[PDB]
UniProtKB/Swiss-Prot annotation:
Pfam families xref list: Cation_ATPase (PF13246), Cation_ATPase_C (PF00689), Cation_ATPase_N (PF00690), E1-E2_ATPase (PF00122), Hydrolase (PF00702)
Lineage: Bacteria, Bacillati, Bacillota, Bacilli, Bacillales
Protein purpose: Catalyzes the hydrolysis of ATP coupled with the transport of calcium. The transport is electrogenic with a probable ATP:Ca(2+):H(+) stoichiometry of 1:1:1. May have an important role in survival of the bacterium when stressed by a combination of a high calcium concentration and alkaline pH.
Protein name in UniProt: Calcium-transporting ATPase lmo0841
Keywords, alphabetical: ATP-binding, Calcium, Calcium transport, Cell membrane, Ion transport, Membrane, Metal-binding, Nucleotide-binding, Phosphoprotein, Translocase, Transmembrane, Transmembrane helix, Transport
Major site of localization recorded for this protein: membrane
Amino acid sequence: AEIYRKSAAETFTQLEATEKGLTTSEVTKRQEKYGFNELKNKKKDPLWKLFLETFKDPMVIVLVIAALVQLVLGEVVESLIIFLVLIVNSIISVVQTRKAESSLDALREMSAPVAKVIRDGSKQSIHARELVPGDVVILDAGDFVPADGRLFESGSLKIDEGMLTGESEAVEKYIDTIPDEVGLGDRVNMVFSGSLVVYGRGMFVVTGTASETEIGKIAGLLETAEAKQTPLQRKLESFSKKLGLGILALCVLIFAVEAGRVLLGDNSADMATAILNAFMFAVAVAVAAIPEALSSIVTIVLAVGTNKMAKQHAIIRKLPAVETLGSTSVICTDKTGTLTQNKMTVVDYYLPDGTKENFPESPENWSEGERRLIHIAVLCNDSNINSEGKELGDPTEVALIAFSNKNNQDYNEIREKFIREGEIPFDSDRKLMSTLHTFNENKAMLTKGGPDVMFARCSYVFLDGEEKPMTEEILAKLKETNEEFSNQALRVLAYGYKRMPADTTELKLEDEQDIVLVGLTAMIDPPREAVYASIEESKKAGIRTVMITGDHKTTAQAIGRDIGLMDADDIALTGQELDAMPEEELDKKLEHIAVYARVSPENKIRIVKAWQKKGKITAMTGDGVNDAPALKQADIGVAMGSGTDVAKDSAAMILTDDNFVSIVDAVGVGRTVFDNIKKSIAYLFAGNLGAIIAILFALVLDWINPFTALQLLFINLVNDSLPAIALGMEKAEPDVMKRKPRDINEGIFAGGTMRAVISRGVLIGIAVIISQYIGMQISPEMSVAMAFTTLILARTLQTFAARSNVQTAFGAGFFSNKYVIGAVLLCFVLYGITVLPGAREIFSIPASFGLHEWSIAAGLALAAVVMMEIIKVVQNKFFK
Ligand code: BEF
Ligand SMILES: [Mg+2]
C-alpha cells in the first residue's frame, strides 16, 4: 500500500538490500526470518472432525439418543438400523463437505518454478521458493513473476496481470515511482507474484513473499473464506433445532404422563414396566418425528437438479449449490472473462465517407474506403491465428484480424497477397509502427497506432479520394467520433497510408506527415450474446446483478450500460473509492451502487461479504483469479469453462460452455428444486406428524404403541423416501421465474406450506387414531397392525395431496407426475411385502390380520387422504 509510492532507492533501503543483490549469509538469515516464499497449504478439517461435526445436528442427536435407548432396551435390530441411517447421513454430509472444501490448494502452481535472481553478484535460476524481500529478480518474456516487488530497472517490460486485473492484457511497466495512490491494478511500478510477463525485460526487488504477496493475499482470503450455509441447510438447521426442542418436550410429556399414571394411579402398576413403556413411547416418538431418510431425499433431489443443469453444460460440484442458486437474491459478476469473452473485438468503426452501422460481411460489396481500411489493418498486423485460433501476441492485433476474418474475409489471403517488406516494432512513446511493406504497384507505406498520435501526425484524409488538406470539418467530425468512442470506452486505433515516395529503400523513420486517414475502428471486450438475456431474466426474477471487475471505471461503466446494469449516465464505484470507504459507508451505499471497477480480489470479497451481510444470497460469478476469493466467499460461486483453474475450483458451478444464460437457468432450476424439496419435506413431516399424533393419542389413553420402532423406521426409510423423491421430481411451477427471491429467514414451512403440513399430519393422525381404536376393539396386536397399516397407506397416498398446497391432485394432473405414481405403486408393493406371512412378525402384524381389518385400515387411510383434499379445498377457498 506504500511500496509503490516510495522510490526505488527508498524501497531498496527499506528492505536493507542494494541493486547489486544480497549475500548468501543475508539471504539465509532472511530465509530463516519470515522466509520460505510459498503458499502454506491449509491442514483443513480431518475426516474425524467432519464426522463429529455432523453429529451436532439436533436430528442426529435425537436419533443417536433413540438408538442408544433401543440398544439398552434390547431392540438390537432397530438400533442397528438407526445407526446405519446415521452412518449413511454422516457419510453423505461429509462427502458433500469434502466436495465443497475441494476449493483448496490455492493453486500454488501459479507461482513460478524458478526465478532469475542475481545473488552474490552472480545470476542464477534460483527456485522461487527460496526468495525473500530484498532479493533482486530479473524478469523476461514468458517468465512468471516469482514474488511481489517494486521495479527499479525494466526495459519496456509488460506483465500480464490477469490474476488481479483479471485480464490477459500486457500492462506496461515503468520504473518511475508513483507520486499518488493508485488502485491495485494500476500499480505500474510494482510486479505481482504469479503474473506472467508477456513482453520485454525487467528487473525488480522483491518486497513480498508467501502470504505477503497479492497472490498470497488471494490464498489467505481463499483459506479464510467463510463456509456459507446453504439456505436449505440453514432452514433445515433452524427447523431441526425446533424439532429437537419439540421432541424433547414430547419425551418430557411422555415421562410426565407415565409418572402421573403411576403416582395418581395405583401401587399395583410397577415403576419398571411403566418406565419401560415410557422409554418405548419416547423412542417411537423420536423415530417417527425425525425423518431418517430426509438427508438422503434432499441429497437425491439436489443431485437431480445438478444433473438437470449439467445437461446444459454447467457442472455443479456442490449438491446444495443448485438450491443456493434458487435462493439467490444478488448475482455478483466479473466483467473480463465472465460478462465479456476476455477476447478483444472490433465493435464499431468510422470513415469520413460514413459508418454503415455494422460492417458488411461481403468484400465484393465492400466500398473502396472500407477495403483500404481493412487492408491497412491486416498488412500492418503483428499477431496471427493459424491453428484452432491460436493467439500470437497482444490481443489488440488479434482483435484486428479477428474482426477482419469475421467479415468473411480471411486475413491470411491478404497477407500472402501483399508480402511484408519490413516493419518497425512498438516504440513506446511513438505509437505508430508504420510498416514500409510494398503494396500492389503503389509501394504505399501503411501505419497503425493510437488516435491522438495519428491525428497529430497527418493532415490529409480519405473523404472520396486524395482530398485537399483542409482540417476543419473532417477534424471536427473525427474528433467527435473519437470522443464518442471514448465515452463508450471503445479503444480506438487510427490507420492511414502514404505513397509519395514509392521507393521502400530503408527501414527507419520516414515522412510521418501526410498519412491520409481513411478511418478508425473501435475496440472493446464485448459482452457475451447471452449476457443481455441473463440480465433481463434476472431483473424479471427479482435478482439484481452487480458487476465487480478489475477493468478501469470507463470500461466497466460502458459494459454495465451496454447490458443495462446501470441507469442513464450512472457512476461506478472504483476500487480505490471502496478501499477508502468504511464498511458502514459501503453498507449504506450498497443497493445504489451496481458496478465496481478497478477492484482488487480483496475488494471483490469485501463486496460479496457486504452483500451477504444484507441478508441476500450473493451469487458471485467470475473466471479470473481475483474472483476466486469472492467465488469461495459467495453462497454460490459460478465459474466459466475458459476461466482459470483456481476460479473453477473455488466456484461451486463451472459453466463449461461459458453460457451466461445457464446462470439464470441454474437460478430457475434451483427455485424448482427448492419447491420440490419443500414438497418432499412437507410430505415427510406431515407423515411424521400423523405418526406423532397417533403415538401421543395412544399414550394419553394408556393404549399400546401404534407403531414399533421397526415399523416407523420402515415407513420413514422406504415407504416415505420414495414418495418424497417422487415429489422432489415435481414439475416446475409456471411462475417459477417471476417469483422474487425467497427470504433467507423464510423458514422451511412458510407461505401456506406449514398449514398444509399441519392439516395433512392432523388428518393422518386422526385416521391412525380411529384405526387403532378399531383394532383395540379387536386386540392390542390387531390395533398395532391396523394403526401401522393406516399410517403407511395414508403416507403412501399422501403423495397425491402433497403435490400442491393449493391445487388438488385431481386438477393438477393425477398421472402428470409419473414419478409420484411409480412411487405410490412401489410403496404398495413394499407394504404388501410387510403383510407377507414371513415378514408379518417383523412388522408386529399378527397372522389374524384378515382382509376385513385391512379393508377397514385402508379405507381409513383413503378417507384421510380424501379429507386432506377436502381440507385443501376448504383452505384455498376460505382463508389464505
Ligand atoms: F477479470 Be475481471 F473483469 F475482474
Ligand atoms: Mg475475469
